[PDB]
Structure formats: C-alpha cells, structure tokens
Amino acid sequence: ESQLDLRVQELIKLICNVQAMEEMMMEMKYNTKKAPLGKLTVAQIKAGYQSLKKIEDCIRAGQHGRALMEACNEFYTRIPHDFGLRTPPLIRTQKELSEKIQLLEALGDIEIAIKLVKSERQGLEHPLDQHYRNLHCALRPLDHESYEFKVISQYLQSTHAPTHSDYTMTLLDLFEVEKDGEKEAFREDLHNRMLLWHGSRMSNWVGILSHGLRIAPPEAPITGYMFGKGIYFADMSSKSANYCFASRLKNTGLLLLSEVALGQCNELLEANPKAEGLLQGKHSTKGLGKMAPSSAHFVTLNGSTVPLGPASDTGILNPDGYTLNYNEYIVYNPNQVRMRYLLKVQFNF
Numbered sequence: 001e002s003q004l005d006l007r008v009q010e011l012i013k014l015i016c017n018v019q020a021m022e023e024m025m026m027e028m029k030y031n032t033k034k035a036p037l038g039k040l041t042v043a044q045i046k047a048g049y050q051s052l053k054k055i056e057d058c059i060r061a062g063q064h065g066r067a068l069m070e071a072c073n074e075f076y077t078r079i080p081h082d083f084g085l086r087t088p089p090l091i092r093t094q095k096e097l098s099e100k101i102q103l104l105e106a107l108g109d110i111e112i113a114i115k116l117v118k119s120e121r122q123g124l125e126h127p128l129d130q131h132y133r134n135l136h137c138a139l140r141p142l143d144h145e146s147y148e149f150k151v152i153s154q155y156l157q158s159t160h161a162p163t164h165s166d167y168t169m170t171l172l173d174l175f176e177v178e179k180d181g182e183k184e185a186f187r188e189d190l191h192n193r194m195l196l197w198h199g200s201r202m203s204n205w206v207g208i209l210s211h212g213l214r215i216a217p218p219e220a221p222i223t224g225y226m227f228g229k230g231i232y233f234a235d236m237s238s239k240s241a242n243y244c245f246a247s248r249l250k251n252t253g254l255l256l257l258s259e260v261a262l263g264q265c266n267e268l269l270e271a272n273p274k275a276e277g278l279l280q281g282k283h284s285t286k287g288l289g290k291m292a293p294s295s296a297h298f299v300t301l302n303g304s305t306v307p308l309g310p311a312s313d314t315g316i317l318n319p320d321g322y323t324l325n326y327n328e329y330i331v332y333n334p335n336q337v338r339m340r341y342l343l344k345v346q347f348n349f
C-alpha cells in the first residue's frame with residue numbers, strides 16, 4: 001500500500017535496483033560471485049584502499065617490476081576481479097589507479113544501499129516506502145510547468161558544453177532534495193554560494209542521498225584526486241553528466257544540483273593533489289577552465305547564484321602545460337554543501 005507519489009516510487013525503484021548495481025560492477029570486472037554485494041563490508045573496502053596506496057608507492061618510486069606485480073596481486077586478492085582467462089593487468093598510470101578508486105567508490109556506496117534495502121522489513125509499510133524512509137532525505141517532485149522546472153531546464157540545456165556533442169540531455173523529472181541535517185550543518189556565513197552540478201554513477205545515489213556528498217577516506221591514495229580529497233562540482237551540466245557514465249543501452253541517469261558555499265576560491269590552472277594544503281585561509285579550490293558561464297546571465301534561486309549559460313571564453317590559458325576546458329570547484333568539508341535538486345535525465349546519444 002505505497003503512500004508515495006508515483007514519481008518518487010519510480011525514483012526509489014531506479015536507485016535501489018541492486019541487480020543493476022551487480023551488472024555495473026561486472027562491467028568494472030568485480031567478481032559479484034566470489035564476493036557478493038550482499039557480502040560487502042567497510043573492512044573489505046578499506047583493505048582495498050590500503051592496497052591501492054601500496055600501488056601508489058610503487059608508482060612514485062618508479063618500481064614497475066616485482067614490487068608492483070605483488071602489490072597489484074594483493075589488491076586483486078582483497079577485491080576479487082573476474083578477468084576470465086586473461087592475467088590481471090598491472091596498475092601504473094594515474095588513470096589506471098583512478099579506475100580502481102572509482103571501483104572502490106561504487107562498492108562503498110553499494111554497501112550502503114545493501115544495508116538499506118536489506119534493512120528490517122515491516123509488512124505494514126510498502127517496501128519502497130521503507131527504503132524512502134531509510135534514506136532520511138526528502139524527495140519532492142516538482143510540476144513540469146513550475147518555475148523551478150523552467151530555470152533548471154534552462155541551466156541544464158544552456159550549460160551543455162560544446163565539446164560534449166555526442167549526446168544531448170532531456171529532463172524527464174525533477175525533485176526537490178532536503179537531506180536531514182544538512183541545513184543545520186551548512187556554512188551559511190560563507191560568501192560565493194553557487195548552485196553547482198555533481199554527476200555520479202547510478203550505483204551511488206542511495207549512498208549520496210542517504211550519507212550526503214563526502215570526502216575520500218584517509219587510506220585512499222592522494223594522487224587519485226587531482227585537486228585533493230574534496231567534493232567536486234562543475235558549472236557546466238555536461239561536464240558533470242559525463243561522470244554519470246551513461247551508455248547507449250543505459251541512457252537514463254541522475255544529476256545533482258547543490259548549493260555550494262565556496263567562500264574565497266584558491267584559483268589553480270592545473271591539477272595538484274596537494275591543493276588542500278594550499279588553501280591557508282581560503283575555503284575552496286577552483287580549477288580554471290577556458291570556457292565558463294558569464295556573470296551577465298547569472299540568476300538567483302533560494303539564495304544561490306545559478307550560473308546560467310551560455311558559456312563564453314575566459315582568456316584562461318596555461319603556459320606551464322595542460323589547460324582545463326571547463327571549471328571545476330572543490331570543497332573539502334561537506335558542511336559547505338546543501339543538496340537541492342535531483343534531475344532524472346535521458347541521454348540522447
């Protein structure tokens with residue numbers, strides 16, 4: 001006897017699909033049989049991070065021989081992969097390391113989803129109502145003719161980046177987000193409050209909606225995070241939407257809009273994993289892109305600057321090396337974040 005609005009019922013059914021998570025983890029080659037997702041613990045995942053840090057130590061020492069082979073073998077033993085007939089590959093590039101961190105990140109958010117969906121049943125409540133209660137996060141659908149829908153649609157469409165031309169986006173539905181406790185934790189005192197994008201894999205939304213956006217743990221290798229262990233946002237919808245990792249066959253995903261208390265940004269042209277130690281008073285890191293929304297179109301929504309598009313050149317160019325195409329924003333404390341809107345997005349490849 002579900003008491004939820006049907007749109008919220010659809011949302012819960014989408015993000016609590018444990019079998020869809022199983023599929024995604026198999027595409028990342030995690031062995032869903034040898035280590036079932038229902039048999040996932042924080043300790044298993046912590047040991048995996050510690051193995052990745054040992055791998056990082058080998059990479060920074062230029063040790064691509066025995067020491068790296070066994071450090072990788074230890075990671076693959078603690079986090080079982082199914083490579084079928086092939087031999088597990090060595091991890092020595094930053095991207096190869098990053099791919100394994102992303103795998104561990106999905107496991108951590110799936111672990112939260114498993115505890116939630118397997119949590120104590122009722123028989124008095126519809127299952128979706130139980131799962132929704134166990135989120136401790138209000139999800140309120142907004143009317144498609146509403147003003148909020150119009151401005152979010154404009155933000156989504158007007159900040160789609162030109163270099164992301166292989167797909168367009170259609171807003172299927174829109175929910176207001178109010179996670180228990182975030183208002184009382186939020187740094188209302190800080191300036192430069194912006195409504196910014198965050199995209200994530202479908203496996204992670206139960207954890208994100210339940211536990212909020214959070215920092216990478218200390219046991220994670222620092223070089224996996226280009227601007228340090230923070231929470232990353234964009235002002236271009238498509239740059240965040242790329243981190244949904246939607247596909248031709250799985251072209252439905254979610255995008256998150258959050259009020260971000262940026263304060264004073266430490267501006268940077270290129271990546272630095274140690275950027276948090278460079279704050280020294282400032283409250284956020286801004287990686288500078290060559291294209292960004294301009295102030296002329298900025299609007300305001302419940303106290304936050306919505307950086308509506310179109311985007312234009314910023315004259316930013318890094319002579320030292322590589323230049324970011326688009327901005328990214330990083331805060332290092334979740335009390336600078338308040339989740340606001342959840343977009344159900346169709347990817348039209």
Ligand SMILES: CCc1cn(Cc2ccc(F)c(C(=O)N3CCN(CC)[C@H](CCO)C3)c2)c(=O)[nH]c1=O
Nearest residue numbers: 197198199213214215216231232233234240243328
């Ligand atoms: C620029 C927009 C953008 C970037 N990136 C990539 C990225 C890179 C490094 C990062 F540290 C994080 C990040 O924020 N993390 C790390 C993982 N998790 C650790 C517990 C958390 C997840 C939220 O709880 C916090 C994200 C996305 O994935 N989506 C996006 O929209």
